[PDB]
Structure 1
Amino acid sequence: ECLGTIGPVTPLDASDFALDIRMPGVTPKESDTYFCMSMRLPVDEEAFVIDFKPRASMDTVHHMLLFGCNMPSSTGSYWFCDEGTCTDKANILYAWARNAPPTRLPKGVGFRVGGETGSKYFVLQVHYGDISAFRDNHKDCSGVSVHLTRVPQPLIAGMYLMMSVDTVIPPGEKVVNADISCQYKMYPMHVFAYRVHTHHLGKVVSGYRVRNGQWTLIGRQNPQLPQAFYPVEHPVDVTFGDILAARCVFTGEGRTEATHIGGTSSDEMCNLYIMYYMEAKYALSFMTCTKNVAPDMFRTIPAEANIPI
């Protein structure tokens, strides 16, 4: 329920506090609606996000996403966001899915936020489902409770985002692959969770670490299944000289015109969010790959990447 008089900040101890990021009592008028809101961090100095607790209605909320960024798309109370979340790069921290219960951060692991370089804002995206549980006209305050601490964490959580930019899916085309690859050139990262994201043309999304020619599965998922962060089968380290490679399999069947990458439901996306940790003294919070630097390498991609899970 809504917090009313106590507000969104709960003190836990001298150095920690819970921040509740909730909808300002909204009432979705249509189904399949996407709401956004923002919260400036209460603290200017560096803090660590070490836990998330969902505060979702168990009937109306389909999924929730939380981001860190410096400039949310809109100011004010709330806005409608078909994942038009931030104006700068939105750094995903958390996904909650109705049908896919989230996995916790490992102990000792946190995202760095605030300070000179970290996110100054959280942006909450809530996707509402069938909205039949709104005939009472009630106000919804679904969201997330975030556990922040100033105690520096020995391990820092980050995001390696792989995304297609140039994909064109001609109408009626049975199979279109969107391939993404980059050489990794940082200190070692350990992947512990992944999220896949396409729109309605996506069949299967797979991500791999390629080392000396060998393909090691990070994650492989049907993007039409709930788009939560799923744990990695085996914590995969990615080290200097490694190549990260991803493939989204698309279809143009059902479409009368070409589908390219874009920000609407009728466009497509090929996103693979690889959540990792790094040693605190080596850590960087975000890396991005929007390229295909080793296209011929995909000829030895495992067969599982081409058949839907």
Structure 2
Amino acid sequence: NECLGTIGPVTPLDASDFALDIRMPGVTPKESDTYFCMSMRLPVDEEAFVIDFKPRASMDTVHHMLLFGCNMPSSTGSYWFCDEGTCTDKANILYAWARNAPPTRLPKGVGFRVGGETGSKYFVLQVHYGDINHKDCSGVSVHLTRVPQPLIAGMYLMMSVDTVIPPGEKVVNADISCQYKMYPMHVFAYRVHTHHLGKVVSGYRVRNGQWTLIGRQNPQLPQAFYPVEHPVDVTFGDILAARCVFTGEGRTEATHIGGTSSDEMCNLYIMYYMEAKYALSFMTCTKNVAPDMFRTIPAEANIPI
């Protein structure tokens, strides 16, 4: 989308709502596959709710975009190569826009809580320029409101930390599992993330030994937030389990979890909503509490998609 210029990034939408445009400050990538980041402090200190996102992407060059909420962006600059990092503190993903997989809207009545005393103070935008003098102001327009939402969006991130993929190894599974101990959450979307060695990624809710699919996807396909086939509640006592299937074929050395292309990642982002009075905005699982449970994981978790 065009650079904003004189009107600025804040557009009043009504007395209690406004649109905040988070855009690259006229950048001009010089290499293929460049990742740029920029941040914006929220204009209001009090709590607000993010209830909608509208992509403003230059269809030709922009491969994908991600928007995070955090309190300490990696750089205080105008923009930077994200290899410097997205946030120093924990970055809370709010939205993903991938070129060949249009995003799905948030369910009405659902909003992410930001600002205030405990919410994110900054938005951090990451734009991935794939195919490239002209300045690009691609980004996202966020719809914010002061009106408390009845349902609060949050994120349950399942991620491996210890995976080691031996060179040439045929199959390597990275399993993650935690017991859920909060009020109930309803999963409505999910996103998988792996680098080049990932074949398939699947997440499940396990209740009384029974496995319910949350999402299963080939991480090589656009890493968008895809809608869940059917809303899945997860309640106190349930166990969340995820498995990423990797291969070492093609590598001459071992691959471990890390930030570079030569490293791997096994991440499953589970986006959910919770009743406002019970809601917590984020949870993470980097452990594998029920290792043997995977002896009963659906076969689909190992068959590519």
Place the TM-score, normalised by the shorter chain, in its bin.
over 0.9
Distance 1:140 1:270 in 2: 31
Q: Contact conserved, 1:196 with 1:273, CA < 8 A, in 2?
A: yes
Deviations 1:245-298 (A, max 9, x none): 000000000001000001111100000000000000000000000000000000
Matched residue SS, 1:52: strand
Contact 2:35–2:82, Cα closer than 8 Å, also in 1: yes
Q: CA deviation at 1:210?
A: 0.1
Aligned partners of 1:162 and 1:272 also within 8 Å: yes
1:151-197 Cα distance to aligned partner (Å, 9 max, x none): 00000000000000000000000000000000000000000000000
Q: Aligned with 1:13: secondary structure?
A: coil
- CA distance in 2 between counterparts of 1:160 and 1:254 reads 32
How far apart, CA to CA, are the structure 2 residues paired with 1:215 and 1:184?
A: 14
CA contact (8 A) 1:83 1:263 kept: no
Mapped partners of 1:201, 1:255: distance in 2: 9
Match of 2:287 in 1: 291
- Superimposed CA distance per residue, residues 134-164 of structure 1 (whole angstroms, 9 cap, x where no aligned partner): xxx1100000000000000000000000000
Which residue in 2 is equivalent to 1:11?
12
Cα distance between partner residues in 1 of 2:54 and 2:262 = 32
Judged with a 3 Å threshold, the aligned counterparts in structure 2 of structure 1 residues 83 and 107 are, in CA distance, closer, same or farther, namely farther
Quote how far apart the aligned CAs of 1:76 are.
Answer: 1.5
User: In structure 2, do the counterparts of structure 1 residues 192 and 145 end up closer, same or farther at CA, with 3 Å as the change threshold?
Assistant: same
Structure 2 counterpart SS, 1:265: coil
In 1: Cα distance, 2:211 partner to 2:85 partner: 34
State the distance in 1 between where 2:76 and 2:224 align: 27
Match of residue 209, structure 1, among 197, 205, 212: 205
Residues 95-121 of structure 1: CA distance to partner in whole angstroms, max 9, x if unpaired?
000000000000000000000000000
Distance in structure 1 (CA, Å) of the matches to 2:130 and 2:288:
36
Three-state SS of the structure 1 residue aligned to 2:272 is strand
The alignment's TM-score, normalised by the length of structure 2, stands at 0.99
Distance 2:128 2:122 in 1: 20
- Could you give the per-residue CA deviations for residues 54-89 of structure 1, whole angstroms, max 9, x where no partner exists? 000011000000000000011110000148211100
Cα deviation code 1:191-223 (max 9, x no counterpart): 000000000000000000000000000000000
Q: Partners in 1 of 2:88 and 2:191 — Cα distance?
A: 22
Contact 1:84–1:263 (CA under 8 A) maintained in structure 2 = no
TM normalised by structure 1 equals 0.98
Displaced runs of 4+ in structure 1, greater than 3 A? Answer: none
Q: Secondary structure at the match of 2:6?
A: helix
Whole-Å Cα distance in 1 between the matches of residues 184 and 175 of structure 2? Answer: 23
Residue pair 2:159, 2:176 contacting (<8 A) in 1 also: yes
73-82 or 152-161, which moves further after superposition? 73-82
What is the distance in 1 between the residues matched to 2:297 and 2:215? Answer: 14
User: How far apart in 2 are the matches of 1:87 and 1:258?
Assistant: 28
Corresponding residue SS for 1:299: helix
Contact 1:113 1:120 in 2 (8 A): yes
Checking the alignment, whether the CA contact within 8 Å between 1:83 and 1:125 is kept in structure 2 is no
Secondary structure at the counterpart of residue 51 of structure 2: strand
Consecutive unaligned residues in structure 1, runs of 5 or more: 132-136
Structure 1 residue 232, shift from structure 2 partner: 0.1
3-state SS, counterpart of residue 190 of structure 1: strand
Aligned-partner Cα distance in 2 for 1:224–1:265: 13
Q: Distance in 1 between matches of 2:77 and 2:95?
A: 22
Worse-superposed segment, 80-89 or 101-110: 80-89
Q: In the aligned structure 2, how far is the partner of 1:85 from the partner of 1:3?
A: 24
Whole-Å Cα distance in 2 between the matches of residues 97 and 228 of structure 1? Answer: 5
- 1:191 maps to 187
Residues in 2 aligned to 1:269 and 1:283: alpha-carbon distance in whole angstroms: 28
SS at match of 2:279: coil
- The separation in 2 between residues aligned to 1:63 and 1:96, in whole angstroms, is 5
1:47/1:115 contact within 8 Å kept:
yes
Q: Counterparts of 1:125 and 1:266 in 2: how far apart (Å)?
A: 20
Distance 1:280 1:128 in 2: 37
Unpaired segments ≥5 residues, structure 2: none
CA distance in 2, matches of 1:19, 1:2: 13
